[PDB]
Amino acid sequence: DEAGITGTWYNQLGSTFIVTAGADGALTGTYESAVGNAESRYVLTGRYDSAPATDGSGTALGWTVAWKNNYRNAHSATTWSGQYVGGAEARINTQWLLTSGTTEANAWASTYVGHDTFTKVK
Amino acid sequence: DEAGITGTWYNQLGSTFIVTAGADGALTGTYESAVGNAESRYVLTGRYDSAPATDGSGTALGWTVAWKNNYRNAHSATTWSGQYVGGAEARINTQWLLTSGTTEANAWASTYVGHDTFTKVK
Amino acid sequence: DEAGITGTWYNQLGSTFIVTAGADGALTGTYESAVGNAESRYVLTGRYDSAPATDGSGTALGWTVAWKNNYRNAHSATTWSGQYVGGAEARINTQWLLTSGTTEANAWASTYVGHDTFTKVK
Amino acid sequence: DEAGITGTWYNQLGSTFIVTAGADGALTGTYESAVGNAESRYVLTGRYDSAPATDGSGTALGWTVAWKNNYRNAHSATTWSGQYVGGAEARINTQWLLTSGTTEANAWASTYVGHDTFTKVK
């Protein structure tokens, strides 16, 4: 599903995920968040299962954004973990972890969890 | 903290995380899990905050492994989200999400969550 | 929102959440899962914010089910953490953690994470 | 493990978890957080597996605190999901989800995730 994953994806917040899937399992591209301490595009990298099951299962993948670019630095990183489901209404269904750099005193409150659904439309 | 992050790290399960931190914010290397459906080394990639706060906060980072190599394919991916804390007893404190490719019927049970602490010794 | 929370709720899997909100912050009732190692109703208990903000924010709440009843014992517990949002299309938006009892060797894989949205219809 | 669970527990932050396990699977008691927007004791309720496996597995359990008492209201709730492991150095190993009431605009950032280990000493 190199073909299926490569392209522009949009989540429910109106963020934009631009990815290229490599034959080797690499994910490379850019992320633009519609929310939070973010402006314009950020580098992303990650990995995907390049030889998924042929039993109708989804394709496991994940990626990371560190929220530093030429405009802003939010001293934080998000990782999305999820699966690509192909077909007419293709989706990437994810859960994510957003960690901030903190002092040791605040480290118990370092990490947000959430979930994003990406589609090829909107 | 390019210097501080680059190297070999070990978690509480005895897994081995071999990483290089690029000046640009890139993380590249290999992961070897002591547990689960895993043998030998797997590619990893990720990102880190290459200009962290100077107030004693940690350095945000994350990375992904897709559990496919030349030996095995577990049809799954893990993402670690966390922060690097420098000093005498350097640590990377993480939380992780492990997603399997599933059928739509089993997708509610696709994702494990856990936490790993990495040190430079053991 | 004692009135708003008390009643029958349904999630996206077709599970049924029957709850009573007490004036004191208590949640009591029963849960019936449409999926997994579950049959019929299980006891639940939890808590909610009985004096929420008046700025349009949601109402924080959570509850637990241990997956033991007179029919089955799945040696596991789920906790839902989320917020109640009132109005014409009332919702409870949650994230959950499902922990199994495990051996120490398997404890790294003890816990699933997911998300459920509850509505008063369907 | 009604006997094993009932009592006073302490986590790595120095919080105090005072619980009674009922023969029926109930957990009732009080929680006092050493960190965050919290003072003194808060009600908790939850559930546990009252007939755990006899193969050395842990005992699944969970509980909720809504962060309202007579002193403060943090408009938030935490759920802990975990397992009790008996013996010389008894532990409750948990992961938790802390949800705040938010506006719909901030709901993506409503929930923290973390992990607490409780012991009978300290």
Swiss-Prot record, chains A, B, C, D:
Subcellular location: Secreted
Location of the motif Cell attachment site: 47-49
Domain Avidin-like residue range list: 2-122
Binding positions for biotin per the UniProt entry: 31, 42, 80, 96, 108
Disulfide bonds: none
Keyword annotations of the record: Biotin, Secreted, Signal
Gene Ontology CC terms: extracellular region
MF annotations from Gene Ontology: biotin binding
Protein family per UniProt: Belongs to the avidin/streptavidin family.
Role, per record: The biological function of streptavidin is not known. Forms a strong non-covalent specific complex with biotin (one molecule of biotin per subunit of streptavidin).
Subunit: Homotetramer.
Protein name (Swiss-Prot/TrEMBL): Streptavidin
Native source organism of the sequence: Streptomyces avidinii
Residues of the full protein shown: 38 to 158 of 183
